[PDB]
Amino acid sequence: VRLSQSGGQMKKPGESMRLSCRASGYEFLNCPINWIRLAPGRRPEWMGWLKPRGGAVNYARKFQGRVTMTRDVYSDTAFLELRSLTSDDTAVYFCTRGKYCTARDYYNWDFEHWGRGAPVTVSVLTQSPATLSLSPGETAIISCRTSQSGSLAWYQQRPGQAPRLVIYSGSTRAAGIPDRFSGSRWGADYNLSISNLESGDFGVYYCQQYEFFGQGTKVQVD
Amino acid sequence: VFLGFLGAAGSTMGAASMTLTVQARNLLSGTVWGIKQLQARVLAVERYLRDQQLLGIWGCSGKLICCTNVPWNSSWSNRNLSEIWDNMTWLQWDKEISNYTQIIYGLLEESQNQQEKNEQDLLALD
């Protein structure tokens, strides 16, 4: 499964922008594609999803009337348009696909596949701690408090790379995730524990419940 | 009383032992799209003869019920006579004994009618 995105761009206020994302390696019609924007030091915002089967779509409230999502089933390419761009829209826009995606059913919100992202410049879930300075070998314990409950996920973003799904269902590791990563739960509280820190582990981590994301925790080497 | 097919499923094993002749009766029941039912009723009769073969090689042959000369091992969920037939359903019992069904089957087909019938072969010649 590979999501190939078009590059980033610089727009002016008032203009409109259009992005594409070509999926490959699986049956495009099986499960929806999502569009999520990440602004530096800002809570990631889920914009909407599209079911390629019939082109069904679902837009976030904030974007209703401004965003238009379509797709080309023949070229397996998803298109998005955003009108009336304002400075608030500066962010890196990603197309995502969930992990579980078979013919029988799917689960949209475990985003295991991410595009490279498109930087566009125009000119609840309580996650703690904000930052975490630790040495290689120690253990990092990131916490996320919910209020709704439901399959929670943990993602890792390395400096300059697309986020990678690390954990889903609060306690289940994804493909390629070693035993060092582990999840736990107590009531509304969720804990991600990373033992024996190493260079690759450092970055920023996010907790997620459906379309809502945490504020993020930057784990850096000291 | 006749609860019907699968009637006493939630009843105790002692109570469900009265409905044996009901689930046994409806177990056999007498261009494409027409082979869909053919291959199904063929697997149906293969499942029937499979169970009849197991029921035959053991010390039963006569269906429904039969006794055997096998001591009940306490490791196979050590329960009491009145705690099985009057406090447990057949689904709940099979859920516990699922580990030892194949072992008992081996102690039934081999240890019995292979040594018992040969013993009769020695007892019937005199």
Added chain:
Amino acid sequence: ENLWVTVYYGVPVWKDAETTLFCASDAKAYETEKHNVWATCACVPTDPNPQEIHLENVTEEFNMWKNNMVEQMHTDIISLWDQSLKPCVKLTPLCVTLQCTNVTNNITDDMRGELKNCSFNMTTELRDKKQKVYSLFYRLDVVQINKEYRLINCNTSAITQACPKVSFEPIPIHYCAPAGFAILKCKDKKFNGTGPCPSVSTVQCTHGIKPVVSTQLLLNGSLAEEEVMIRSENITNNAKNILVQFNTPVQINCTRPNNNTRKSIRIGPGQAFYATGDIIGDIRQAHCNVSKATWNETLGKVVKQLRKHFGNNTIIRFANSSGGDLEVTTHSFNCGGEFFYCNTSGLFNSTWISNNDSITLPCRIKQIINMWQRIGQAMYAPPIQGVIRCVSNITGLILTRDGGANNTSTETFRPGGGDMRDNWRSELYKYKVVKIEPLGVAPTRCKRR
């Protein structure tokens, strides 16, 4: 005192499994003949006196979202569609240049034609002289190319014309299980379709389920008991569809005010194409009526059930589809052989707070379809003579909820669909397949010498 094993054959013991289900469709439906309509050809006649055994004291867990009968029915209808279209006339030499023009009518400029009067060449019975014949196609069926047009499916797949002998009329089909299996049925009045069921009964064959292929609006379905039912695999998940089942059916009337002519142009030898001749009468467009009062009471009864899951004092707003293909943005269905796509913007345009005529909807008609998101097989629906009128029951909806809310207490719902498996899940929620294991061993004080 020491117990002894005893083999019991015929015990009420079943386990969840998947098997090969066969069909059943009464005995009067076979008298419908007409060269095998839909499927009923070699289907087993339904038992005149079906038996439904209520399993007392039995509580069995169902799961409409992990049920294999839906996948089996889906693949069965797909194979049905292929077997029904294999021996029909293939329209391979029909992608010829179409010199189309407006239909004979009188303005305005907002009528946007819709109907195109195309003239073109055609191969006759002999392989020499051609044939300059004309037909009448819908705009959704043609596409211009640089007035010259072409069929919209030229660079997609092949095309085969549906035979006029068969029909697409959904007839009740009973799914039955072979010997050794059984179908469990939940008979509680409030089974919202997942988990343990208090009153479980066993059956050999399910009730007559008509395979009505439709989107957004569930037509000719089973009515719910007491209160209208709301079913979802994950309510907090806005990506999972929400199947709504009605208690009182909503009367809908759809008509095709364009009583048409069938021209039987001959693409011999043997094959024959059924084009659309001239229209006798007025140039009118198909439309659907929904009784305003019935729609109000149904919506007001549904929003009261929606407030039981998204908070008591919340605002529920209805909006129509956000966009995509015609099969998802419109109410797609079949009536009289024609494939309608109706505008459902007059039904989902409301805003409900915590506390006398008909609604007409513009319906389009398409002849070249590719349902079930199938590529490789395009079917040309032959024209149907006479005014087509049909009265159906709206018995349920397929809704989707908007996401990324966080802020605000209102929730917005839009019509969805696409996956035709959801259309089958609205009828197979109360059934599940189990396999019988009659061999059960149990200890008792019985032996021989």
Added chain:
Amino acid sequence: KEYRLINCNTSAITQACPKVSFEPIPIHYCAPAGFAILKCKDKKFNGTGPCPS
């Protein structure tokens, strides 16, 4: 004078393969286990009703 095949605007046409033959060969029809075929062996059976032998 221009002609054509008489079956052009009727159906398709396939040529019979020269390998096979249309020679009527005796075919015995038999019944599976559990069934039987009754045969009337009277010299004057005009073919309907009870048969003596």
Added chain:
Amino acid sequence: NITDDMRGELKNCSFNMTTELRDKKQKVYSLFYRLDVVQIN
């Protein structure tokens, strides 16, 4: 670019083709191996 001992092997063939429509043809070219083609006079 040569020599004469390279014996081509690869042939750059141009030809007609039937398009989607049963009217205008299609002047397209392909590249076939010598074992796949054979000249005719």
